[PDB]
Write a protein that binds this ligand. Sequence first.
Ligand SMILES: *[C@@H]1O[C@H](CO)[C@@H](O[C@@H]2O[C@H](CO)[C@@H](O)[C@H](O)[C@H]2NC(C)=O)[C@H](O)[C@H]1NC(C)=O
Ligand SMILES: *[C@@H]1O[C@H](CO)[C@@H](O[C@@H]2O[C@H](CO)[C@@H](O)[C@H](O)[C@H]2NC(C)=O)[C@H](O)[C@H]1NC(C)=O
Ligand SMILES: *C/C=C(C)/C=C/C=C(C)/C=C/C1=C(C)CCCC1(C)C
Ligand SMILES: *C/C=C(C)/C=C/C=C(C)/C=C/C1=C(C)CCCC1(C)C
Ligand SMILES: CCCCCCCCO[C@@H]1O[C@H](CO)[C@@H](O)[C@H](O)[C@H]1O
Ligand SMILES: CCCCCCCCO[C@@H]1O[C@H](CO)[C@@H](O)[C@H](O)[C@H]1O
Ligand SMILES: *C(=O)CCCCCCCCCCCCCCC
Ligand SMILES: *C(=O)CCCCCCCCCCCCCCC
Lengths: 326, 326, 11, 11
Amino acid sequence: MCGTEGPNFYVPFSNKTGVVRSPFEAPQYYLAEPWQFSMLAAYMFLLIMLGFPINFLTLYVTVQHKKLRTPLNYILLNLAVADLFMVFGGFTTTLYTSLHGYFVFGPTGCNLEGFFATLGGEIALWSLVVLAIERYVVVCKPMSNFRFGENHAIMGVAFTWVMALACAAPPLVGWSRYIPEGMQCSCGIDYYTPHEETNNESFVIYMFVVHFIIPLIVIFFCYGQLVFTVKEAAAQQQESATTQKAEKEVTRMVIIYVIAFLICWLPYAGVAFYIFTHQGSCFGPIFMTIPAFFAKTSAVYNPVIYIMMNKQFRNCMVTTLCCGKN
Amino acid sequence: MCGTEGPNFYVPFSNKTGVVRSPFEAPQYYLAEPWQFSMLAAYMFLLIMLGFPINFLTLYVTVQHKKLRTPLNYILLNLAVADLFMVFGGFTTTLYTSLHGYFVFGPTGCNLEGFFATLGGEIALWSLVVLAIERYVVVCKPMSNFRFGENHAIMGVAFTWVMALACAAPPLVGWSRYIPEGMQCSCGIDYYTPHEETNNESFVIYMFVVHFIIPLIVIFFCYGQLVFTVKEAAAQQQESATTQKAEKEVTRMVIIYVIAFLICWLPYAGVAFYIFTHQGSCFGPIFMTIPAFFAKTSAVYNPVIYIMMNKQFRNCMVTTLCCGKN
Amino acid sequence: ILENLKDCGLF
Amino acid sequence: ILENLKDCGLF
Ligand SMILES: *[C@@H]1O[C@H](CO)[C@@H](O[C@@H]2O[C@H](CO)[C@@H](O)[C@H](O)[C@H]2NC(C)=O)[C@H](O)[C@H]1NC(C)=O
Ligand SMILES: *[C@@H]1O[C@H](CO)[C@@H](O[C@@H]2O[C@H](CO)[C@@H](O)[C@H](O)[C@H]2NC(C)=O)[C@H](O)[C@H]1NC(C)=O
Ligand SMILES: *C/C=C(C)/C=C/C=C(C)/C=C/C1=C(C)CCCC1(C)C
Ligand SMILES: *C/C=C(C)/C=C/C=C(C)/C=C/C1=C(C)CCCC1(C)C
Ligand SMILES: CCCCCCCCO[C@@H]1O[C@H](CO)[C@@H](O)[C@H](O)[C@H]1O
Ligand SMILES: CCCCCCCCO[C@@H]1O[C@H](CO)[C@@H](O)[C@H](O)[C@H]1O
Ligand SMILES: *C(=O)CCCCCCCCCCCCCCC
Ligand SMILES: *C(=O)CCCCCCCCCCCCCCC
């Protein structure tokens, strides 16, 4: 037996020394040196620094530029907004609490902070999904005589919201629960504690299956299809060097999209699983931090990949940033 | 009487409470809350994060690309190298020491850390100077039949090194001195203490004059001349829309170069002066940090302005970064 | 396809 | 000038 238990938490440390205190109550400097709390903060800062500009600028530019306000772009705005919840709901909170060494805002604090940090990152995920689906529809033209309009874009977005609530809301009302995770400065879903009174075991799977594998598959299908369609059209049109580039560059991106997606959600799935399947096993509060380190940084690199690397968007930034000109 | 004195330091706090300890010896948590030391660290992290890539990449790209290895580019490499001393000699040291709450490496530590952090930032400064001089020579063609070659580029660089030693070396051997400044985690030149045994008063001026005003003037002259020359050539050639853009864009940059230069060195000159001219006056250890905050961040924004915004360099990055292609 | 590719920002 | 301007990376 590895950790410490309390009504609304689980501390990854052995209170045999009698030093363990509630993370809602006192600094966990036994869990980790203070300077390591400092580095945690350093990070949270970083992600705020890069993440808030990049993502906010995305909304901003979409305002200065009429050419951005198209249906195929809605989901991308969803994506930035999501990231912003991830910043203000997660990153900044955790910067504050990390600096105390414990989750100062109590359990309600843990529920909110957990809920928005979680809501935010799921919208983002399902954005990335919905996105690939639209791109597949529009390009692989799977349904004949079908044109993608504003009214689809709207559902697209709504659907990410529903999907996301379908995961962030349960823990708030009994199926799984939110608890300071890691070094106990932030509050995640419970997926490592087998807490029968809330059925963590089940939710964990439902999470794993609906909120990981589905996405994973869909995304892989839709993009495969597309790197198919475009690789084919290229062959059938060798005479064109442009169509040659397109197909080449479209591949390069879909590889990225995918690689980058595993980097984000693999760690949580990898851990959730290994934990589920090694239930008699002790997991460090730093190591418990690893999966969440990856999942949070995507609030920086998803904007970069899906927005700054998007040809349309990029221009208007360079334009906006360099003062109306260029 | 405001601070505390010791053999090799000066703490901006009143030891009437009897709490003040040597910054080479114990945490200065009375000077500032610990979380403020954390934020100091957070920053140092940031500048390492952004600053080390940006500057290092600059050398790297200059290796992959033969078109970069031209004399007019040497000083720019100087500029990046400088910035790297600023990173490894200053930024990272200060990240370590900040995390203890005092200058752990002692006075020798203070001499080194001070010397390289100082050397680095002066090379950078004089780079920026030498640069403007070359650009003036090459473009304003002030000396007839004169062409700028590799052998000038070389001196150009050497001259920044000599200039820089002319400021970082004196304090190491008696004229002024290095002491933990600010919140005492980093070690700067002494310019606020009137320490007769080393003649701070004089060096301070010599600093102010040779290492601020000279640069300031030269830079303003050379670029004025140039925004002159190019504004003229534009007029004399209205028929050309390109020469119209050039002159317009060259102005925009020289404005930046200049604005950005005051942002870097104005605070130190502004403070050094106001202190020199209000000698009976108490200055906070955070406020003593302000001027140095500006001067250090230039190790991020100078690469961005003089390198990432340089048309040649930018390409090869985007090329290198996006994997040989694009 | 190059048209739709553009609308999606993929090329 | 546009030639020298380029060599300096200014335009
Ligand atoms: C971990 O360590 C100690 C010892 O088991 C627990 O603290 C004691 O709690 C009782 C009240 O329940 C107090 O009267 C004692 O003074 C406490 N001892 C010390 C040294 O604090 C503590 O509750 C345990 N932590 C958790 C999370 O349950
Ligand atoms: C600031 O505060 C105290 C009190 O003036 C100084 O510390 C004393 O130093 C003597 C030796 O010189 C010791 O025997 C005492 O025990 C110390 N007192 C305490 C409470 O530390 C301290 O030196 C002063 N700091 C500086 C920088 O001179
Ligand atoms: C910053 C904190 C965040 C973003 C926490 C998010 C955690 C999740 C979204 C966890 C979900 C998953 C599991 C718990 C197990 C399988 C993989 C996921 C992504 C479905
Ligand atoms: C990170 C610490 C650094 C870079 C400290 C640098 C401080 C200087 C280069 C100070 C020099 C100046 C004065 C002391 C007064 C007048 C202005 C300067 C720039 C010449
Ligand atoms: C959703 C999953 C999409 C996977 C796409 C894998 C694409 C591999 O695409 C690669 O393209 C190169 C040309 O660009 C070819 O030379 C390689 O043989 C080919 O494997
Ligand atoms: C070394 C100092 C250089 C200062 C350069 C100041 C340049 C001001 O350049 C500006 O250019 C505009 C066109 O681009 C003109 O319309 C403005 O009248 C003019 O002031
Ligand atoms: C309008 O044309 C403005 C153009 C120039 C903008 C230049 C911006 C340089 C930014 C450098 C990095 C600054 C932040 C460093 C934070 C640590
Ligand atoms: C070769 O073509 C590689 C091309 C793609 C590089 C994509 C890089 C995305 C980087 C996003 C930001 C990552 C770091 C975030 C640190 C907090």
